[PDB]
């Protein structure tokens, strides 16, 4: 006996099965925006 094995699950009273999954995904977003700012200020302002 050469090989070594890892245990993945034990069931003393029935079936054991596994599913192994791999996902690879690529995504890209393009954003276009536009803003209008209309500010104003009142400042008064003599001796000191």
């Amino acid at each position: 006996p050469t090989a070594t094995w890892n245990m993945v699950g034990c069931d003393q009273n029935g079936k054991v099965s596994q599913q192994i999954s791999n996902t690879i995904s690529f995504s890209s977003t393009v954003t276009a925006g536009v803003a209008v700012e209309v500010s104003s200020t009142i400042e008064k302002g003599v001796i000191f």
Binding site: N13, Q19, V30
Partner: protein
């Protein structure tokens, strides 16, 4: 007394690139029989 009025216009354009990868494992266990070897038709499932 001083008074100002400002008008600003902004325009933006971005582009994002995402890529990802995941892996998942899923083990499933079913209760099929009791220790006595009769078929399981009710009872409880236990985890060590």
């Amino acid at each position: 007394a001083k008074a100002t009025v400002s008008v600003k216009v902004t325009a933006s354009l971005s582009k994002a690139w995402t890529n990802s990868q995941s892996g998942t494992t899923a083990i499933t266990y079913t209760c099929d029989n009791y220790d006595s070897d009769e078929e399981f038709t009710r009872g409880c499932m236990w985890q060590l």
